[PDB]
């Protein structure tokens, strides 16, 4: 048996953005969560529905690895039952989530002097997203009934805003690389367990 590739999802050199969050289907591999608790690097390890002790005795059909980057004072919004600028416009966790949320500080790997503006997020949207839905578009949000035919002018603005990651920003603004392991049980064979 092989070692399941957890180093490309947690130790990647370049992560993705929250509005266009990547999705890695990790299945038919031997996931080892025992080395995760002893890593002594996870600033936040909260599992909803499952327990860290019960994660090595249960096998899930699909372990979907949704990876993105968010702020520090913001990770609590990625949880069943929260609201904000992200939990309704970019990526909504369902209220019946049965997975875990991982995060750690990576200021020394996701920050450069003068600015690193390579990550973006949604700011304006006409509605609220359903859970587990992604929509990539730069359409201009009509805040009134003027209307606006594409020009960013009076009460019509660009939706995509950037992330200002720099070495000297605070702990609550430092990049917490988050991989939301979304365990679920389906009607297909399960072979992913430690």
């Amino acid at each position: 048996t092989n070692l399941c590739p957890f180093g490309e999802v947690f130790n990647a050199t370049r992560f993705a953005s929250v509005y266009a969050w990547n999705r890695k289907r990790i299945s038919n591999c031997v996931a080892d969560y025992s080395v995760l608790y002893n890593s002594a690097s996870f600033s936040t390890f909260k599992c909803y529905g499952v327990s860290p002790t019960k994660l090595n005795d249960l096998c899930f059909t699909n372990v979907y690895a949704d990876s993105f980057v968010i702020r520090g004072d913001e990770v609590r919004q990625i949880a069943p039952g929260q609201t904000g600028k992200i939990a309704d416009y970019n990526y909504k966790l369902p209220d019946d989530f049965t997975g875990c949320v991982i995060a750690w500080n990576s200021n020394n790997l996701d920050s450069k002097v003068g600015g690193n503006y390579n990550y973006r997020y949604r700011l304006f949207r006409k509605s609220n997203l359903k859970p587990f839905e992604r929509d990539i578009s730069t359409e201009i949000y009509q805040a009134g009934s003027k209307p606006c035919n594409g020009v960013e002018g009076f009460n019509c603005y660009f939706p995509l805003q950037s992330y200002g990651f720099q070495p000297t920003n605070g702990v609550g603004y430092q990049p917490y690389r988050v991989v939301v392991l979304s365990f679920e049980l389906l009607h297909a064979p399960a072979t992913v367990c430690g």
């Binding site: 600015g115 304006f124 805040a143 009460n155 603005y157 805003q161 200002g164 720099q166 920003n169 605070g170």
Partner: protein, 597 residues
């Protein structure tokens, strides 16, 4: 599809973009305050101009939304701070002339030299130069020459510029639905939209002139005692009935009376309280100063300091390879970054300074949850008050003995409390009429109440009646004495130095009474009690979202301003002063003048 929803969308777009430009505008300024160099000297202007252009365009675009349709107080408060045009309503030529005058007034004050053309040795700089000859000199003519010669050159070339400034700013202010520039400056204390806590611009003068009447009593006895004591050093220049000469108050103008303590000590045989010999001998350095000052704030219940407060902060003078301007300013970079930059030295005046500048970061750490336009204190004289009561509780011999600075058995007697109280009174009481008369003069001259011919007579006419200070030589209408001050040349407000002193004693009395103390107010402390820290913190979290009257009531219980706590604080010294002033002539006469022969 309503105004209060479009305003929210516009405010969200504004808020989620300015945080990325203000931080870079602050970082370059931090690097400059670290490094005086011609290479980085233009980054300040580039970052400031880009941010001003962003702000100017946003203010121009925000004028399309009226204020009579919004019902949300928070949204109205955020939008009112963005619709203030400022000087953008003037014409192009007038704005250019105003900018030229503003940039020339500062240059003339900064590059103005004073020297005696007949003697080569009578030349010196300002700080620590001309400010040193006026501080520790006991001569009469040496001070008279330096006092007259400063306002004969710097104060004489600013009169046309100030005359043009007054008429330009009157037109600037009359275009914004205001009356004058004085009415523009009183708009900070105006609170409207809340029932029961309404404050008007026309009530500030009534409140101040009512608070000054209760104070004048004690200042009269203090002035009488100081004038009686000064008879020993200058026996042939002061009258025992008249007033005090202007150039004998301790510094250039007379705002503070601190330097006069060395001549009018009540008890000269007692060892004064001192920690300067206590931090040099104890191997105490700027790192341990802050490491010890942290525990005082932790003891009352306040949170701990951040990680970046130690590594990015500058504490010591960075040698001679680089120049750093270290005037007292606390630095809040935003985006979760807090640092300090001070000129630390082993002295008592710097330990209390470190405590005062750590109170500032403790206050800024509280309201970080408020939006960008509301991340500020209640008003201008409100941020400097909460950082000053911490120094008052650390200099008492209950805490100085707790940190080992003072002697473990430093006796507390009636001969030490008098010495402490006189030193405390010389710096606080002596400046209130000085601030009040200057602000009244500005408000009276901006309103057109004083014509051209009495532009300089009504200055000494109120100086000789309110503060009891006469001039050594007469001045005609050509001079302009008030413009020689830094805050007047750079057009800064002055009533924030009058309101903070009144607020800081009310806060201290409320907190110490919540701290369950029994005894005189000058001996108590708030340490080792969480019920005072949690009482102050609820007020600290408010920010600009609530009116200052409500913020004051949430702690003290009175929406107005009072002087009773200050009078109770200084009653112990007033009782002894009333006894010692039996043979003196209490009060002054306005008919005396040193040149009236």
């Amino acid at each position: 599809s309503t105004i209060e929803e479009q305003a929210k969308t516009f405010l969200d777009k504004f808020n989620h973009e300015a945080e990325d430009l203000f931080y870079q505008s602050s970082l370059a300024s931090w690097n400059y305050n670290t490094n005086i160099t011609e290479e980085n000297v233009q980054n300040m202007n580039n970052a400031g101009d880009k941010w001003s252009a962003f702000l100017k365009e946003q203010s121009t675009l925000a004028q399309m939304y009226p204020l009579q349709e919004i019902q949300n107080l928070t949204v109205k408060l955020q939008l009112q701070a963005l619709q203030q045009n400022g000087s953008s309503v003037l014409s192009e030529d007038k704005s250019k002339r105003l900018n030229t005058i503003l940039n020339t007034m500062s240059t003339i004050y900064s590059t103005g030299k004073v020297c005696n053309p007949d003697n080569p040795q009578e030349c010196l700089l300002l700080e620590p130069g001309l400010n040193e000859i006026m501080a520790n000199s006991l001569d009469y003519n040496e001070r008279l020459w330096a006092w007259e010669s400063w306002r004969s050159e710097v104060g004489k070339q600013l009169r046309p510029l100030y005359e043009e400034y007054v008429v330009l700013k009157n037109e600037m202010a009359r275009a914004n639905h205001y009356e004058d520039y004085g009415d523009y400056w009183r708009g900070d204390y105006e609170v409207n939209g809340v029932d029961g806590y309404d404050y008007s611009r026309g009530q500030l003068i009534e409140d101040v002139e009512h608070t000054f009447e209760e104070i004048k009593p004690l200042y009269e006895h203090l002035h009488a005692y100081v004038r009686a004591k000064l008879m020993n050093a200058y026996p042939s220049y002061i009258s025992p009935i008249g007033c005090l000469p202007a150039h004998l108050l301790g510094d250039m103008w007379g705002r503070f009376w601190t330097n006069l303590y060395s001549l009018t000590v009540p008890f000269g045989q007692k060892p004064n309280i001192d920690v300067t010999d206590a931090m040099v001998d104890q191997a105490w350095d700027a790192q341990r100063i802050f490491k010890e000052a942290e525990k005082f704030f932790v003891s009352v219940g306040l949170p701990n300091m951040t990680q970046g407060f130690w590594e990015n902060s500058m504490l010591t003078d960075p040698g001679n390879v680089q120049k750093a301007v270290c005037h007292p300013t606390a630095w809040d970079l935003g985006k979760g970054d807090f640092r300090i930059l001070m000129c630390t030295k082993v002295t008592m005046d710097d330990f209390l300074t470190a405590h005062h500048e750590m109170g500032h970061i403790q206050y800024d750490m509280a309201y970080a949850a408020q939006p960008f336009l509301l991340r500020n204190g209640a008003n201008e004289g409100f941020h400097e008050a909460v950082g000053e009561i911490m120094s008052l509780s650390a200099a008492t011999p209950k805490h100085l003995k707790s940190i080992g600075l003072l002697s473990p058995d430093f006796q507390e007697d009636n001969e030490t409390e008098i010495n402490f109280l006189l030193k405390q009174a010389l710096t606080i009481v002596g400046t209130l009429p000085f601030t009040y008369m200057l602000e009244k003069w500005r408000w009276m001259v901006f309103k057109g109440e004083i014509p051209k011919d009495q532009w300089m007579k009504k200055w000494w006419e109120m100086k000789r009646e309110i503060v009891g200070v006469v001039e050594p030589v007469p001045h005609d209408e050509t001079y302009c004495d008030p413009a020689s001050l830094f805050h007047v040349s750079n057009d800064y407000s002055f009533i924030r130095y009058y309101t903070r002193t009144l607020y800081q004693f009310q806060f201290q009395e409320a907190l110490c009474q919540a701290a369950k103390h029994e005894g005189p107010l000058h001996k108590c402390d708030i340490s080792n009690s969480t019920e005072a820290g949690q009482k102050l913190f609820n007020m600290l979290r408010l920010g600009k979202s609530e009116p200052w009257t409500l913020a004051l009531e949430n702690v003290v219980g009175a929406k107005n301003m009072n002087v009773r706590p200050l009078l109770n604080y200084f009653e112990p010294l007033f009782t002894w002063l009333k006894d010692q002033n039996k043979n003196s002539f209490v009060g002054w006469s306005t008919d005396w003048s040193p040149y009236a022969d």
